[model samples]
Target chain A: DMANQLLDELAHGNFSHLTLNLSQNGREIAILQKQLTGFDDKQLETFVEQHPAMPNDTRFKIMCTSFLNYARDVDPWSAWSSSDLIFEFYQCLINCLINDNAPHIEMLIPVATRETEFIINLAGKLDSFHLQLHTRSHQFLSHISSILSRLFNSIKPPSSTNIPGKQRILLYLVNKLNNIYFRIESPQLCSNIFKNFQPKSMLAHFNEYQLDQQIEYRYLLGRYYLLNSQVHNAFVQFNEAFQSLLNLPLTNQAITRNGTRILNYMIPTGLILGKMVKWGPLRPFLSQETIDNWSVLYKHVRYGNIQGVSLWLRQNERHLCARQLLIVLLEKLPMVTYRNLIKTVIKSWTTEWGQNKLPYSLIERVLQLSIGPTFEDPGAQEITIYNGIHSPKNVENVLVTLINLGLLRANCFPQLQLCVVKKTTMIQEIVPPVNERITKMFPAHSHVLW
Target chain B: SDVRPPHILVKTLDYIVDNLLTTLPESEGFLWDRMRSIRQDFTYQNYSGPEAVDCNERIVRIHLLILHIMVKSNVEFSLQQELEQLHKSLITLSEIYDDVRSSGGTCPNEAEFRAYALLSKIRDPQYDENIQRLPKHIFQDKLVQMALCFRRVISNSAYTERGFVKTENCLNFYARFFQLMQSPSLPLLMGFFLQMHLTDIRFYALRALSHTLNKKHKPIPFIYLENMLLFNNRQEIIEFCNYYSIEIINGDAADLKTLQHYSHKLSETQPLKKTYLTCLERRLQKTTYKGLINGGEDN
Candidate 1:
């Protein structure tokens, strides 16, 4: 109502040059807030559906942003898209199997793991497609457990599939989780009826290009190995999935499309899981040739024929994502950590506003704020998210919560305020005593910037 | 700068003799010739127009289906050289017709210049590398047959509308031919034209598919009909008022005045839409706009 009224009364005859006022477009929200105070289920649904554009509106932007952040914390895969089943399963099982969130298997013997029998039921129903084998067999469970063990041992699933556009973004996430819990390093509980079964490739030809129907081939393979406790093999394949995600330019959203950058986040998340199991130390056992193969596969990001793929696919309909942050990161990150630096590239996302769409600038701000502080800021404190909070005796308390994040290079040099008091103090007070400098520089703006 | 046109046929023949026929030398020519002479021998079919197997409708149709599969299957361009060559041959034949009609020259001159241009364009080694990706000997063998196929179609009669209307099966064939021509796959269209066995079915089908595929690089299959009437057929020739007009100016003196007017109109419009004599495959480009709106809040 307000939008139309404002448009009708535009001082200038031509309104094309004028910017729209968002606050005036908040009538729908006002009505919704009034209705949410007391409304029937049908009314609520209608209200929700009627405002499909609400998430993009300035009035609701904060709520939507927080919702997304919450979703990311609770279910990282859901941050990419809503279709992920594996992330759901992992989320459902967080406290079900093991009451304690300890990252080891020794403490899990008496855990009452439950909450994911739906897969077994779904598998039973889909027995015709032969999609879920473990639900159909018993002897197969032992083998699947072995495979799952191997999967968790080495590599992580790729991040490219995490993008929001395209089909099955979240489902790929679930598939990734399925690889972790059902396949590798874990004993299989379900019977194995299907092994190495791939979805049938639906064939289509246009011009001379042949597009494969299946998108998550590696994810499925990774899960299959993880299920049977083939940890090493599963790791190899899972890492292949991760590398496939990395092979696309981080900023090149069109090549991968949609919430794929979420896959980047998931790769590190999975790598953390692997590191928890000390899998990092086992790289020496693998052959140089095998590692080189993985390297070459990832090398496709920089060297692959993007032209050939785009031309043959006629992929002109691509998402408009800004690559500025990713480009900056690429320029700044040292070559030694090329692997992580490459993995972290992300495309810009946007939200729709009244009569116009705007780039999701808040997330962009958050991204910018986090980058310099966490990765490059000289005054950055070695901060961990959670530490022994100063509370009851049961709650462990620590001097610096930042030091607990393991981001700290060494001990803090109290005298010089430099990190761990390096023998050579290259730069002085400006670089040293990061927390003190930060405090001195911005006494009033701690929360706002940080 | 170079004026000399390389005799590709000579080099091609030399390659076949030196590299291809080393296993079965001239000493075995008698046996080979005997096998070649045998009726409908698939294994030893000659490269001549009639015997060239790939240009046959059945073979050409499979090629279309294969191309369709390639787009869906992600078959690399380098690996599908045979199909590419086939596309090239179709384009070449179409362009040759344009060269003669637009440049106002004899067929031989058009053919000679076009071949020279094509040879110069593809002198790169990567072209050969691409050729290696296709099925063995299919390109050379199919191209010769394609040339022969063109010869057969231009020589065919059964021109009267009544004859085409009578033969319903002919209409179906013509339609299929047109679809093949309009297809992005170059060789497929050329192969359809090579069959030369146009009827109402063949001609109409060609018209319909060409109209549809014309959005991209359109290769109208039975265009040879027009070429034949202009250059080959004399007394029975008639000019349609426009492409879609039901009426035509007959060569018979009974409609001489009607013929002159429509012919004059055609002549006036010809310059505007003439297919370039040098390259018929090129077409005027059109544009489309697509993108998401930008600038917004945090969410």
Candidate 2:
């Protein structure tokens, strides 16, 4: 029964194109070559000759077909160790004297191998990288078709230019054309093309984050200002932003919504915090129901949901929301994942704003933040710990920064034990006093220690 | 060598309008007014400017308020009803704007009156007696408020911060508005209308092409969503299924949950209907997967 099953399995394996053996051992030789000599043209040319047709002719064809199929469909790769092996094999097979008589057995082995390996190498590296942008090891060249055509025309001039420039141009064009054809055959590569065209600035910015950049810090900062349960130092950031805005020649202009990019994503973050700040302290003086409205707006911003706030801003420059200042913050420090997280958070918060019971203070706070209002609200104060659960380190950093900024009474609040003690007391005692005290002492000082 | 003059020219008019060039210089203002007036007269579609804008503003605010209340109430019936009502209104409103663009008219009104109406609807509990019966989330809800806030923002104008980083945020918000119109994720049309504050004509054109195509048409078989959703044709479907079954029979299993989800959604429609129904019923009934791949089914 086992013997019969084995026979049946072998038969089916022969029929199936996607055999598991395709992945095994085949890449080992190539990997070894790359490890040793670093995947050069000479190595590839030698491998091709070693892989040509001969004694095991039928098996050789099968292997060739499998390699070809994988090279074309699975992932395009041609040269290196296999190419060298084939080249050696081919050279071993065919003599320079040209088959006047039967070729030597010794010559046939390498000759056949080299021939096969050469084809594989030709199909893989040269065609693959130029078109596919697949291998980081290979140089990538890109241009508009018109530019390419002009370059080609210029290089292969009716007469001639410098030989090396011509040679380089001809080689570049040939490589580029091959790459283009490969891309044409594979549309799946188009989506990834955006990966190749990064400006140096973006790369630098990406590096600046050190990958430790996370939504948690922003989330904590947001929660600190938005909770409205107790006042935290988060508002200092917003106030700093606002004061900076104030120092500018007073346009009092507002950008609400409509065209959006990275910064629009950042607005609700500050707006939510800003509105919360104004709920109690700034409520009466602020011209609008800023808090409640902004709370609602914050939800929409998170989910990538906008109703026309942006369009509204474009039309009426007079009504620019002060929360729009956050837009500036977002633009300067925008991260792709941060934007995504904000959108997610907004979506999560969307339904929270609809209530007759929603405080008038909340509405007033939002309006105040949007349109310039005199005071940040005391009732809207929320206590946020610098360090929450997900990461204690960032929380520590934020708290430490606040202490350094004199926004937090370094010794007062307990990390785990502090609670909102008489909401008014929480607001009047902890936050404003520190903020005021800090400014009095350090006149021109700004920036948290972090 | 600012050689990119043509590209720069595209946004030049918007830049001027955004900056309120009419307020800039005396001589320049004279040219600005004359040019503006002439352009306005030439571009004069009665519905394109302030007048038609009024209608959109009112409709958007009102619909958002209504949706807000319904969502806060969490009344299943009201949620469904409001969604339907909002969709109807949006379709009509979109048509009106389309007509305005074609026939030429100014937008209708400013944000003030519309905001007033919106506030009254949201704030007055008496107008919606159902509010008492509904959940607290139904009234003055965060999401509904966001919808209103965004509507107000989009209907307004640009700020001095345009030259700074906030520009992308502005554009992003606008992009979302257009995106809302086209995404097929349900509660469909209501989601689109509520989130439309961020869109503009350019964003709309792009979204209309990409998103509308994704939702409005069933994908063209092997080329699009259907291939991912259904796995080629019936033949491919059977082949994969059988292969999966064979694996399971032999005590090895692939992700039953994945297989189940795909089967359930795909089978709900024709061709895949029977399979979908079977899988869906199992999903509904809380079927167990005997320690497949992840060892348990995901909720």
Candidate 3:
């Protein structure tokens, strides 16, 4: 009822001073609503001019909701005349956030989308405040950035051509958005937010502005690509980020630390995409032990050492799992082993035997010995390969797995119980040689030239 | 003399399965004596001795006979005591045989030789030479035959709740084995055999192989899908749909409820004929240009 009365006064612009014998609640509602909705087009200017001592709460409420209700007549373009007033209100909101006095902040959430231009204006102001930016200012920006991210997700993009100014402001906002998300290690949410950007708008901002050479920005973009299963696209971004990090001025200690972290994430992806990642200058940032483990694993995977791979994976499971690279590497691990085993089997059979047909049982035995136990029985020392006796069923299942993976070039004969091996054939390479991959690194460099 | 107790015990086991409770008083003493004699023989047999070396088949038969008796007989103090002794003997003999065999002491017993022969029949002899067999000394060595018994035990509602953990474990193990075997039909068969048993076991087998069907080599044969839908739960059906990337659109809670109802009512026999999958597929297809609009830049 009090709120309804306040709304009645607010719509009519009736902000005369208090009456006698009023309840405290009604007076508070009166002030709060007056602060929020009393302003019409250019109305706040006269109010502020008359009352220079307006409270911070009044200013904050005005900042948070000023554009929301006025959009009908005011028009977003015409609203730019009040940019000075909006920045002052933004400063008050930042002051509230910094002081941990963020009351009525949630009130800003729904209004954010309707007033995205105002919010972008506020962000543009914050971006230029680096000289006077304190720790609390950084804190205020991150909190506000998250709110803006949610607001961006909720609102549909404006149905106009494009604004390079708005795009640049958003580009800055998104970098902060991605940075906070990365710091918290929520890559999935970060990926979803990046999906909001129209590629044309984002690339346009990057092209026209050309100030987007930050490794942090590219690493985040690469991260989005990786999470979305665009590994090739991810490789391109990561490669560029690596090169950019290399060319950064050496005196930039903070950027240097960021570069080190980027390399840590970058190396595993290179292994995953089968590209050679040479950490020539960046090698000092990573531990020798870390580099050696990854290199050995990568080498074994490439050159057909299934035994060595299994052993290495068992010992280093904890190390790799901690970095969150284990699952991605694990998916590749079995495929690599299967491919190598198939190639070696074909090669050895050709060398030793005259006939092209190799016994399926022979291959089954080799696969079984490599895989160890498939069942829980302690006394089951060996897997059976007998046909009618029921052990061959288990052995044949291994053959089926390999065949399904397209690692085998053979046919199964249920009757003759023989798998005819084809001649030694080339397998699709997962990783190219170091020299070949060097050429691929610069391939993405030309994309920025556009 | 050495085989007398086992022969008698075998006879007694046959009687226990065939005859009823009316003959228990008449045969109780005779069964107890044979059980005691077999226990005594196992106790004195030096499981670590040279005789136990390269003697996997002989030990396997002895342990298997004991397990068969254990499977058939009702529990009693005397039988339980004898079974403990028998279990120890089996483990010891298995250890000795494994030790001898690991060092390359080879012998072609009935179990090994039969597995070898089966291998030769299933695959060529020359290529199949190095294939090894599970030691017959272990329980559930013949997985296919064991799974047949597994199906029978699991089919009955009697012990399904009592041994639920073991049942789930067995289902997953055999399901994984069947997946490896490339016998998608085996899980379907398990589903049908245990249709009345428990829906979880049936769904467990289907869920285990859903990934294999969805991503691995081949499209699931229509028959396999039919067989899988024979028994399903809400989660399994939803997961199956999700795993196959069956994207649903334009509906909310009601549609999901309706989908569940449709899923449960989907019989393996008639749904294919009625084109239920096609009906569901229509609903799942993305009609909105959301992907095209957003997916443009990636392309």
Candidate 4:
């Protein structure tokens, strides 16, 4: 019924009248196949090379249909036996589809799709023919991969398929695209391949091996998101990689290397999101320098050492820059760590002032010193954050943002240019009770045995 | 003609003449002698401006100070070269230290020399004849120096990030030397020092294990090294347990029990229980952080 409607449209000049609906032209294709089978390779070659049908000519549809029909009926064993005439016809068809840019190219879409399907089906049927027909199978697989790659790339709004066979093909297409993406390692291209896939459909492509690939895939996705400064989305992918890594045996180097690799993404994103990672087993895989830097930062914040933290920032600026971590660290750590630093500074000021207030200028100087000089002017005394002009208001907005994030518990007195640092909600460490039991289990005499 | 003040120039001239020029050839000696006299006459005496003097004299003093700093910096640069040479002089120090420790000997002067040599070795190799020969005293100070050098060199630097070449020999030497020392705590101690070179040393240490275990000699007890390598993930620990034939019934319990048991055994036999204990404590800390450690109960 659909084919008849398409033929009506072709008849009414809705599309080029030469366009044949292969779905409706099955009987005609059978007749064409019988006529083509009588010709030998030499005659087929002559027809393929010198045939005078241009792509827009009505006879061009007959030529395409005949070649596809001949290819479809060719026995796999004989197809593998010789590529002489069949290969030439295949190249000729590809050239005709690709060479023209006019509306004539549109008429070949159905034929191209069917041609791809035929090759795929042939490759699938030739599974046991692997040893005898190495090049033949490889060529078919490569062609199918490219055709599917292009098909997926050009599909706009992805259509859902309920047919089990079509679903399997979609699954196969996804797997092939994944292999292509892995071989290339282009994140943008990989993302483009997966972009139109529904999460449900994409999930079907994952098996035991695909589960392993999923970790790497998600990591690459996270890295792309990280470079683009989409931290939340980046975190989602990284966490997915992390969770997947947990399911695999710890001896898996994929998990080991990947666990280490994702730290590059995780630390920055986790900080921006104000989420603390357990970092437990992944710690040793961390580089010594990374560990040392994190330890220094952790200690400075935990102890509320504002001066020391700023001093560390000055010395490690180049270190951070080398890791591409400077911006994220500056964006996130000052707010996270300096919540402690600011609270510490505020407490000291309150003790000195005998009240819960300090001039906004003093707080500004403390923050400025902690944040260090602007990248533009190191000698400048004011704080320049994220390219915003130096203003008490800028600093005020920083505190306000922190307050909104629930990290800071203080009210800003913009009128008085003072801040009353409120008492912070203290978080208690929940030390496991078993620690005490184990400590007592080993006595001083047993210290010899550790 | 130089921008340096006369006084600073004279001081440099005096320094070289009085100290460094002693080893100079006679021709160079006579040349320095003539320069020194000239420096004394014009720069030191005649142009030695009064203290607190203003105008031209003060400008001269400032220039002199700048020249003095530059000459001192130049001397320090040469001393770095001298240290490198000294490092070469003490190339036999590690061999000597190992031999002395194995023989259970103690000698202060040679030990001090060996310590200095090892210190110099990392900052900058030892000589041809010194390669195989072993002698002298083993000092804790020398071991400390090698550890310090390993730490200093392997720690992160812009030079390393920019692809500065590492001294593979120094790395290999210390790693082997520590293993040869046979003090189980030695690898553990070296672990703390070369944590930056953790993966590299782990490579050689594992290579050493593969070698000895495949042949006639007894396998080295690399308890700490084995634990440290498997320290990153529970799956690796399980694999380690499997390789060692430790039966782990389920869910990290068998793994933890086996590691804890091995750690305890090594601690008893190893001389530095403090070091071994400290190392195990760190590993346990990570285990706890991973939430693998629990009360005496099954999940």
Candidate 5:
């Protein structure tokens, strides 16, 4: 009985009464689907145009149903399949209603773009639709990135106290945009998207967002800063982000997936910057690639293997630099590796001579052995930073760097070519020069990323 | 004499050089007034419009005249406006000039004008976004490939924006120009670009040395700084060092022994005796007749 009312509501542009009422299972959508299936493609597409008197928000919904139906025949797989020009017809109408800066031969529509509920449904439905579309298509990511630019451009700006602008949804759209950028491996575009987000008060309105978006925002912002050569900013962002995730269960794959990705950059970056990590429960489930890079990094820093570190860089530095991970390795890792090597030298000297004062020549000789020699021109393509040729003179540079950088606590006798390390007064100098513990450490697994 | 409206503007170009870039003998105010009316007729006829992406020598000469008038008539033309107009025209000419060579058309006149255009754009202070650095190994950038493979341009410029403008925009553009320059042998032009090329090379080299010293305990000796920085003697090094406020080590100004540490400060260099436009006018005059005429310039 009420089934006849479905067509009447649809015809009269009762968007919520028809679309939401039958956006479901069983005979209601079945009957509407059957009725929609019988209409002519051109007739239905043109028929969708007559929802005249209602607001754009209501009209846009019925328009979406008509276009989705007219375009759905010939194949249901068409949901994920490419229909380039046909869908653009549907896109143009929505863009007219939503885009703020769009010229008006263009709107003046206030309701669809400004509503809070409109934001929630579009964000979730796009989120859900994106997942279903990609699940069946063997190839869909590039396709998603192509259309995701629409949501990225069309989403409303954040709201304010005095004003009810389209708000709260931008950060989610940005987060979704970040996902496609990361997955597609076009990180150059990543930094480009970060600007032009079309609003103000990210810092002002930050806490008003949900904890999940905060987690994604902080984590991705950390990654963004990490890409642009800002290490300390990255560490702050990643640390706060990963800490917020602790309340979630290890049983949740979000923890396993996101927790591991965060720690992957944060752990190496954290260790080099003098923060020690404590291993936690989600450790065993990381991707094999994450585990291997960690294992190589920790072992090299632990043993003071500058030679091995350089070799690992040659093998992996290209991709790591692309990830902006290599810059951490280039500048800080060498200092840490040498600092560790200097610690070993102190231990050995104390063992043999029972002297805390280590000769600079002995440390210099060990550096030459571990770091090897530098080329006069290492060529321009070389991204992994290496050392200058080892002289007691040039070796002094490394010593000065470590001291100045606070990686090693030592007084330099530059004239004497000796380092009487401040911390060496302790018996066995086997520990790190600067010990800051990190509570969430990696569970050692055999994995390598090149 | 040429008859196309822009070519007619080129005759005004001849009169400006004959009257202006050289010694202005008329009453100073009279010469300046004639120049304004001259440019009014000049720009009124020849607008720098977008055209086919092929080098038109007469149109190029029109633009070259625009640059000359803009630079020489300094009181009326705002330097910012001069820079913006020069920038837009330079990028346009460079694109057409690059395409000419990229499409396998090579000629002597095209190369010379392109060089002059590059000097015009790069000689000034760049503002806003820094131009993206060319990745050095782009064999696919046909223009860059052509420029690199030619490996034939030399002679650098002497006048720099270092004295007047020490902003990031100026410094960054200086880097792009120095990177583009291999070397050149052009008369009258060489000395101008030679100063430009070497000045940037010296500044960048010195800064890199300064940052590298943070990694060094031993002070770099005076002789190495002298030879590496391409200074005349200890005095040239001392003047530049004191001029830019980098501290000297081991000796006072009297002894001039070595540089203790270098500065990362964005201090202005010592002012040159001549400005870019003063030297630039000479290059313009020296290249005018044969440079345009021999290129099969049309009426």
Candidate 6:
């Protein structure tokens, strides 16, 4: 009865009845594809051609939609190996798609990774849907990435300026591709995908694209630019995203997760752009991880302790790597640390006749204490010694580089042995690259930089 | 929704051939603008027709000619935009070709363009930094993109090269590319290493990072030497290091003495004679994508 049950269902062929059985029973009972081992689609194909009172396209679509829906009910691991079935599903969709029966088309692409491992109330199955769809859409895009890129790409654009109808689907596909690339840890593919979509950019008709879509695109692009080391774009993009994202209410855990992550990125992005977060007490919407790491980063950068900052970063390297925040700190914080070191010197040493001079030897000794090259251990080396990096010559070279690059708001006297701490630079005055790392944000020349 | 008509595309192709290529395609005078205009003719192309298959395959060399020259230009230049344009055209062209080609059509240079686009994506500093994930594209697809990005990161990280693009935000990128090359893709990637001139950049990066050890006075294991240098074999790193008078004080730790403090703008630091920097420069400068000459591809 089961072998020919689907055949019988199709044989009698009530269109609305077929959709109900699929749409309801798929969630209700799930007639898994493996159970239908006795059936062949060729039988269905012939039936599609020769069957009773159905329209030809309707029959083809019903058969295709049935196969697609059944395939979704498959256990992904066992089903993934069968390209023949996958291709058949693709071919069927393509067939129906070409005939402009996207209305007839429906598929629930399967995913193995369920993001829900939580236990809760009636509200609990929801985050499961939230995160799972985040993941399921990731899986959805991987399929489309292969079979669907060309499929969506080949679809004809309408004669109108904007075809919000099918064109919206194309944008959804692009967003799904972003989901796949981001989920898989390959934003390089995202960049390529974004650029490839620039036949005309994917962002269009803000009012029409729904508020959530606009925010997510900006959020992802913000993360993209942050990783890109372009802080200006990164900061504002997330700023725009987080600002409007708040307007949607703290209604769902999905947005809440997005909220925390967006805030997580913005802190470091803002930190580098010469902005600091002033905590509004323990009434915090921010994560503990964000509260702890960033507050510590601010404290150390303020104290002018390069050693303290370096030591802390090395310890927490694992923590930052998850958000991929470690590199920006590693690359630019040294400049910021050194810049503050100048202030610390001026703060402690400034006196007598309004002088704020920094002696090169003081700069030299501070660096020597902090750095002093790698030797296995000459057993208790003294504070005052020679024959290593950051010598007087190198110390002066460091200061000149720092000063000339404007990391230190000071002028060095070439003839005398000191630098004049120039800018009345308060603790926060020196924003880094200090003319260095920020330039790293500019578009590079065609010098293999791209 | 907008279906591309073959006539418009063919007519555009006709315009390119009829007035442009035959009348001297050199980058001279207003002819510069003429070549520039040809790019607009075929920009962002993605369409399919039964007869359109031929048009897709035929345009490969034309796209390459512009791209080859565009790569020669320095940075976000007029040269770079055209280069980016050529890269996009090749991607879309083959993107369509694969669909049509499956329906039975072809292009010999499709793999080449696809491979280059993957590399361009990886190396493009504008959108790449920190730990951006690389696509788990197929072996060849990833190896090309992976190896090229690795070479650029290693090159960028060298102390000898410091600029906006040089300081790294890509160790995860660097680390993963290294891992894949060493473990899964070594055999396939070896020729690829040389293909993209990856070896020299890594070797140079290794040298720069070694700063006076650069202060690491200790010798690491042979495995560290091999993995770090990306040299797969034990003997290769040994011989490679020895070639440059690198000291073997701790054998295969690949320690060094002569290269320390050698910052002359001249020869004492020089061990091997290399023209690659200038040569790669010349390659782009002199060559335009040579698709087929006489009866074979000049590439």
Error of 5 at B17 (Å): 30
- Worst-scoring 10-residue span by lDDT in model 6 chain B: B290-299
Give the candidates in order of DockQ, highest first: 5, 6, 3, 2, 4, 1
- Greater-DockQ candidate between 1 and 6: 6
Model 1 chain A: weakest 10-residue lDDT segment is: A388-397
lDDT for each residue of candidate 6 in A1-450, tens digit (9 for 90 to 100): 332444445444432223322335444225535544444755544544454543456635464445534543444443333434443444454444443343323321111001001001112233234353332323333444555455455545434554433455555556655654565435666776556654533334444566676677777777776666666667777777777787875568787777777787877776665556666632245767768767887887766665566557657655665666655665445545555666556655653234566677887777656543422125623211111111223444445445433454454443365766534434434334442454443332221111
| Candidate 5, position B298, lDDT | 29
* C-alpha local distance difference test of each model: 0.26, 0.29, 0.41, 0.41, 0.46, 0.46
TM-score of decoy 6: 0.50
TM-scores of the candidates in the order shown: 0.16, 0.19, 0.41, 0.34, 0.52, 0.50
Q: For candidate 1, lDDT tens digit of each residue in B173-277?
A: 222223223333334323222222322222332232222221223122123334422212232222232332323323221111121221212333442111111
Please tell me which model should have the higher TM-score, number 1 or number 3.
3
Q: At residue A431, give the lDDT of candidate 6.
A: 31
Listed per model in order, the count of residue pairs whose N, CA or C atoms clash below 3 Å is 85, 163, 9, 2, 22, 18
Off by over 4 Å in 1: A1-285, A299-450, B1-299
Task: Let me know the DockQ for model 4.
Answer: 0.01
Cα lDDT tens digits for candidate 6, B1-299: 34335567666655654555433334422433443444344443433543343443334345444333333333222444444554554556545644543334444444444444444444444322422222223212333334333433332333232234433222212232343333322222122322243444445444433431323445545675565445546766676666566677656465543455332123545433221122333433453332221112221
Candidate 6 lDDT score at position A314: 57
Predictions ranked by lDDT, top down? 6, 5, 4, 3, 2, 1
Chain A only: TM-score per candidate: 0.21, 0.18, 0.54, 0.49, 0.64, 0.68
- Indicate whether candidate 3 or candidate 4 has the larger lDDT: 4
Candidate number with the higher TM-score (1 or 6): 6
Cα displacement (angstroms), candidate 1, residue A159, comes to 55
lDDT agreement of model 2 with the native: 0.29
Calculate model 2's interface RMSD in Å.
24.8
What's the C-alpha lDDT at position A156 in model 3?
A: 32
Q: Residue-wise lDDT of candidate 2 within A1-450, one digit each (tens)?
A: 221222233223331221223344345333333333443444433333354332233333333333332322332253442433333323222222122223232333333333433343453444354434333222212222223334343332222433332332233333343344233322223223212222211222222322112122222232223222112233443344343333334342241111111122233443422232434533332335544555454453333222223322323222322222322222212121123232232223332332211222332333233222111224422111100001111122222222333333322121221211112223333333332443353233123322
